Amino acid sequence: ARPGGIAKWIRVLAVPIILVWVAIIAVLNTVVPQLDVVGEMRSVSMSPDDAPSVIAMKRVGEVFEEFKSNSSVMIVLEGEQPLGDEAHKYYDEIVDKLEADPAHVEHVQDFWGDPLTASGAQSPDGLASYVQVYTRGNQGEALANESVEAVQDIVESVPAPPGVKAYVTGPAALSADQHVASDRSVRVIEALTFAVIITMLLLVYRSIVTVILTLVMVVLSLSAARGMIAFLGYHEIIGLSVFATNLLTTLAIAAATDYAIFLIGRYQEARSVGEDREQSYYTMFHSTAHVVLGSGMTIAGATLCLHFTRMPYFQSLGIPLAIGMSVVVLASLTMGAAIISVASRFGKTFEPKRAMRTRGWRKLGAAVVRWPAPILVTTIALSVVGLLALPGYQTNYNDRRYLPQDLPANTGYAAADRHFSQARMNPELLMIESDHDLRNSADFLVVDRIAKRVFQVPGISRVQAITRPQGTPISFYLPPETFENPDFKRGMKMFLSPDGHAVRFIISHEGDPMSPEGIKHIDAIKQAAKEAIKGTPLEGSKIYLGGTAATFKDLQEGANYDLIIAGIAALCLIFIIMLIITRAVVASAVIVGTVVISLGASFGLSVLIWQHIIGLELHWMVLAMAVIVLLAVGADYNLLLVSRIKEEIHAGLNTGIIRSMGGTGSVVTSAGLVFAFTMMSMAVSELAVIAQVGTTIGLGLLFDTLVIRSFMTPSIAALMGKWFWWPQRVRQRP
């Protein structure tokens, strides 16, 4: 703990460091609009540009020369009276104003305006109708969001008939309203988070000056991280998703508070022993700076490991989170060290106010070292009972239930569900692109065969084709005289390619295409079409199938494998960081394995609460987003405890554990409580996925703070003895 190294440089350059950090924070906050504005502008596609569903939909748009993007929303009309006179008119002005805005609307698939296909766009009771309009964008980008906003504005501009109401729904509408749901509760999230942290810092320190300075450090670090992320995103360097902003804000605040708590706790412990301010600061730095740096590097690397998946949301989550956490770590180490150094020499600023809680934690350490075998067994049992949630763990792929029901997309879905069957606003599009003109009598037998065979597939409730213009059935033969009928000419134009080389089918699911059963439906439809076109003068045609079910098939087929690989990479990277810091293989393995064990209890608590008490099943992204943060932060707490043990080995393996636990008990307890409660502060989010992720991470941090670091790791250390620090040389005796 001799004065020297980076600590002395920071202490002597404290004021310049603070001024430089403040200046760059101001620059990054005054040269770019804001993080929320950038995230709205730089929203990422919900699906990769090379996904089979995206390619199929763009190919359908290109062949038919209608659209070129991958965004579409459904406009549904709901009237108290049956849709009749003046309702068709209202629909007509709506579609006319839609086709007069090429900047947002690419094509309007007008089925209800055509008497041939009018019955196919109406509900059986006749009280509702819908039209699919194709907008510009890729269903998740910003451009798609302004497209949906423009469509809603156009719909609301037209005066409605006395009893007819129009809604704008669809998966693109749901994605667009995700952003507006976030940017109405993100402020509530940050306000509640700051209130919680202020209260808990007041409880921990009982000092107003210390709390104010901790808030200053946290606010400056958060502003630096958010400014860096906004600067990167605004320059189209990184992509930002809706979840990225919320997780970045909460994680930055919580991690900054944790680093401040670590530094201040070490400084105040050094002061309580009876060391002057300079030696106290030097001891704090030499004991906690590497721990904080490694703790932040673990979070940064763990979040970075998400970039290696194929899901665009997870890449948009990965790099920005890593950059934000790294900026938080620098603005914690350098800024907090400088601020502590400056403020210590201004009276009783950071001086401890109440007491230190060694005696209780020393008694707990004595209990742990006395019975290391009976303990760690209770902890393994408490961590594995969460696996009882596997027989019954249900995941939900539909984002409809994870958004407030008052959003325009949810309202439109609710209105459609009153009159139409389930998932009629999410149709599948099947295109079979041939190599010859299909507008002859022979090929319509094949087309009708395809329509009939796809309809006969279980889980398919409606197939709309040229031979079934209304989606319902009317040995087949069309006389050539039908080809000159103008009604049939319009039908072929609306269902066949302009050159006649492609045929289009609209397919509606019996159930929800969100589920993996809807994923099996895609393969069933493709196989049925391939067998239908078998042994006919149409073989070799390229089958394109696109829609919601195909999109989520492309998302989910490799998602589980990608997430497993990402988690394994995160574990490996955290283990490498622990190995670099502690220089002990066994200690690093224990640190990274205890959190893996506690993942069971975290998962059990989350699947219990959300799936049973609340009733809302866990979103299929929640575990993926939560496991990374859990592994990072639990390993960080274990790192702090293990490093403190390492500093105390010279007194003995058992006395070292006892003294280290006594030293770090209250500090790590406060840090873990702050992190967990900041994480669960997302419970007020209007994005139920965000709330689920936050509550899961908070419950996991509460569990491991109360169990793992307290009893499991110390008991493992006591059991291992000299082998805990392997292959490090161990004194092994006082």
Author numbering: 21 to 494, 690 to 949
Manuscript text:
The genome of Mtb encodes 13 mycobacterial membrane protein large (MmpL) transporters. These membrane proteins belong to a subfamily of the resistance-nodulation cell division (RND) superfamily of transporters and are critical for mycobacterial physiology and pathogenesis, with several of these transporters involved in the export of fatty acids and lipid components to the cell envelope. MmpL4 and MmpL5 share similar functions in siderophore export and are required for iron acquisition. Mycobacteria secrete mycobactin (Mbt) and carboxymycobactin (Cmb), siderophores with an extremely high affinity for Fe(III), via the MmpL4 and MmpL5 transporters to recruit this important metal that is essential for growth and survival. According to the protein sequence alignment with MmpL3, it is speculated that both MmpL4 and MmpL5 are proton motive force (PMF)-dependent transporters that function via a proton/substrate antiport mechanism.
We then collected single-particle cryo-EM images of the MmpL4 transporter embedded in LMNG detergent micelles and solved its structure to a resolution of 2.95 Å. Our cryo-EM structure indicates that MmpL4 is monomeric in form with overall dimensions of 110 Å × 75 Å × 55 Å. This transporter consists of a large membrane-spanning domain formed by 12 transmembrane helices (TMs 1–12) and a large periplasmic domain formed by 2 hydrophilic loops (loops 1 and 2), consistent with the signature of the RND superfamily of proteins. It should be noted that our cryo-EM structure contains most MmpL4 residues except for residues 495–689, which presumably form the PD3 subdomain located right above subdomain PD2. It should be noted that our MmpL4 protein is a full-length protein as indicated by size exclusion chromatography (SEC) and SDS-PAGE of the purified protein. It is likely that subdomain PD3 is highly flexible, evidenced by the fact that we did not observe any cryo-EM densities arising from this subdomain even though the contour level of the map was set to a very low threshold. Similar to MmpL3, the structure of the MmpL4 transporter also forms an elongated channel spanning the pocket surrounded by TMs 7–10 at the outer leaflet of the cytoplasmic membrane and the cavity generated between subdomains PD1 and PD2 in the periplasm. The pocket located at the transmembrane domain and the cavity sandwiched between the 2 periplasmic subdomains potentially harbors substrate binding sites for anchoring siderophore substrates such as Mbts. This elongated channel is continuously open and directly connects these 2 potential siderophore-binding sites. Therefore, this conformation of MmpL4 may represent the open-channel state of this transporter, and this channel is likely used to export siderophore substrates. Based on the structural information of MmpL4, residue D278 forms a hydrogen bond with Y852, presumably enabling the transfer of protons to facilitate substrate transport.
